[PDB]
Design a protein around this ligand. Sequence first.
Ligand code: GNP
Ligand code: GNP
Ligand code: MG
Ligand code: MG
Lengths: 100, 275, 67, 146, 294
Amino acid sequence: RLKEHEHEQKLLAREQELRDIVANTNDKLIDISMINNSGIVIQGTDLQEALDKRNTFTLLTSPDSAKISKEQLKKLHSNILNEIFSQSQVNKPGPLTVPF
Amino acid sequence: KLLLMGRSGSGKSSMRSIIFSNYSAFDTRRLGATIDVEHSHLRFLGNMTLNLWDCGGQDVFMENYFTKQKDHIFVLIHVFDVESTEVLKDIEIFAKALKQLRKYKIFVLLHKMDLVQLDKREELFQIMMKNLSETSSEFPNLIGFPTSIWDESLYKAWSQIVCSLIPNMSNHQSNLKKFKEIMNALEIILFERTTFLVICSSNLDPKRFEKISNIMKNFKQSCTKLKSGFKTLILNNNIYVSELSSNMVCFIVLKDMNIPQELVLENIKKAKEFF
Amino acid sequence: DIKGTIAFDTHGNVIESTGVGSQRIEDIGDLSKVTLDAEGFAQVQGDSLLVHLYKRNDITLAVYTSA
Amino acid sequence: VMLHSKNVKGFLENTLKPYDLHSVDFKTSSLQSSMIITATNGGILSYATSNSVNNLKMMSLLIKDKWSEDENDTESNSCYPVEIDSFKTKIYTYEMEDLHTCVAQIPNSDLLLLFIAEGSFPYGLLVIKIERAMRELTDLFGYKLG
Amino acid sequence: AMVLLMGVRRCGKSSICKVVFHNMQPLDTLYLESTSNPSLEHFSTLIDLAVMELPGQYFEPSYDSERLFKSVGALVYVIDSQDEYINAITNLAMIIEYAYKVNPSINIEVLIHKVDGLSEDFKVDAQRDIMQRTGEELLELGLDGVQVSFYLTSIFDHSIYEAFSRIVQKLIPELSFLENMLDNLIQHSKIEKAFLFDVNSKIYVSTDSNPVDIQMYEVCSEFIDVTIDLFDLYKAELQNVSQLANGVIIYLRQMIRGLALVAIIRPNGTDMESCLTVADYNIDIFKKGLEDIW
Ligand SMILES: Nc1nc2c(ncn2[C@@H]2O[C@H](COP(=O)(O)OP(=O)(O)NP(=O)(O)O)[C@@H](O)[C@H]2O)c(=O)[nH]1
Ligand SMILES: Nc1nc2c(ncn2[C@@H]2O[C@H](COP(=O)(O)OP(=O)(O)NP(=O)(O)O)[C@@H](O)[C@H]2O)c(=O)[nH]1
Ligand SMILES: [Mg+2]
Ligand SMILES: [Mg+2]
């Protein structure tokens, strides 16, 4: 009857719904070729990435130009970088090779 | 070298075919009866080669061995068909081998144990040994095993047999423990490459090594279907089996199931050189 | 009063960035090109604020004030 | 010799630590993950993190691929040469998806130290991080795969 | 769904039941004794089957059977070779008459059984000329039901396992998708053949397009047995890899509902880890595949 109509459309709707799952899984898989040629991994700099975030500067030689003194700059530079380097040292828990 | 002796039907040649020639428990029913002594020259550990004196079982031959070849003939694996109507005969032919043997390591095997019902297996081995040991004293202490084709205890038999002639035990046990140390294993077992008998344990199932011998023999015998020989098998990252030396294969079981593959296989490979 | 810092190497990428630094990273482009004195310092202004440069051991610190 | 897994997981886990500068208001997220991988295959030998184990093992193979491709060519920027105790090496700076990666070969060995971090984590900083970490891997210099 | 497993009394009904499902050592089935009352071994896996042995004594269409057959997915009649099978065929045609009468869509499978000992030639000889006499007794009975399914099986072999696999596979609804979905898994990865096995049963739910050389099925089944035998020894997901000298890889991973994917991998030259990592990636999506069908 009409029940048979409704159910028959469904069974066919479920059937195509399954074809979708197949097709998606099938789409999702990976080959060893894709690995070899894939351009997922590319050389990068921070300059590049900010430039793709998407003349400019005028120089002043006047002594009166500076708001922080040369000595203030020097101290901040040495301070930042040494904090970085000191914070960058990391120790082995033990010898990475063993005898035998 | 190695005397394989016992009366007819007791599956001496059957054993020889299984553990050495790599017959399976089934195909051995093909074997024709041993005529005189069939010698088998096969190597173990590379360093030592073995000569298997698979003697005849028929009484014609048997009675001949203690006559015109007694001097010639003189370890002895002497096997015992359990069902034998003539038990005291087989005991007394064991006695016959014994005296001539003073002329010059003794192993007794209760073979075909798969036939007698499970309950009266314990009792039946006990009484038979009680006898053979008393007979053997004329040696003081006798070691022998229940042995069947259709179970793994055949391998546990020859394991305790072959290792009795291995001198490497002092060297190897030291050289294996020192692999367990680095690997942080639960245990490592050493097996010979072809025969698959247990050589050494490092350090809660009691029938581990006999069973492994069996399971591995069968994977390897199975591997022929793909047309290539077994090298490695990695299970859950817990269990590692690797081909290692030209005459050794190791069964490692790790304590942690996430120490990366390439590392374990790298450490296996570095250790591989030593032994 | 400092409004931010960028500190970068000479490959293009950055070692650290605070304040406006982290936002206006693009500056390293034009900044790294600035003519420096023999001491390694420079003062430039290009975008309603003033950048100060110092370059020691191939590493430039840029700091930020205002007009 | 053979490699001490525990100490290697240790070092690698120590390299996960971020920076909390107060020279300026600079602070980084932790390093996302960090591996020592084979230079020959790009297979994981040891990892630390702040199935995924696969995702990593996979990434490894991808990065090693580009590294060897770059490494073996005629001729100049996203690659820092570095000298450590007269042992020489190259640090490479790659972008992969949203991540900032940084791979350098442990000198003379068949082992690549490779760091993976967030997008927020600047390259020039990772270069320092990896170089300074590298200087403590003296035990591994020249390790050829068994 | 369920399946009717009938035959000529004492011909290997209970035998294949015990050995398929309980991994029984067949000589223990030699000492099996007549089940005279209908007995059913359930089987779960992907589909929730139920296998029902009927004792047999000719056809005798009983009062209940009219609904019972109308409630059957497929019918496996077992003909014992090495006995006069003409009575078995005479009876068989009468059964398929009732099945087709009641439920026309029933799949009819026939097991040519106890074929192990007989020579390959003696088997071919038997089969080609048993098929003839089978269709003969049916030509006499109206039209020809296209249920042509002769599976030459020996309990002491891998023959039953392969047969039952092909039988159950024939019932599984989502099968066509499983094959193509599994098919292009083994296309992307470097896999020559892959099977989804019930770990306990040892029968297979699905394979790929490429030919199922029984030598290969044998390898994969024996592999499962090895990984389980070893694993069971030491307990103080579930996966297993082995490499042979030639470079080929056997792989096994636990999957949904007692199933387990087991595959053979060609190295083709490349690194094992590369092959294993790509495999694992794909197999992960594949696991997501059959997880998202249930
Ligand atoms: N059930 C069982 N049968 C066994 C076992 N060992 C051997 N057999 C069977 O008994 C037979 C013994 O044959 P064989 O190996 O030649 O024995 P033998 O000791 O060499 N006899 P002989 O020296 O006179 O030739 C084989 O055909 C085999 O089928 C066992 O452990 N269990
Ligand atoms: N060679 C061989 N023997 C078999 C095979 N299957 C069964 N047999 C043997 O033949 C006998 C009959 O098998 P069985 O399954 O018991 O018959 P049944 O159909 O269950 N009898 P029933 O109708 O009373 O239930 C068993 O004792 C068994 O050892 C087979 O594939 N090959
Ligand atoms: Mg013989
Ligand atoms: Mg029965």
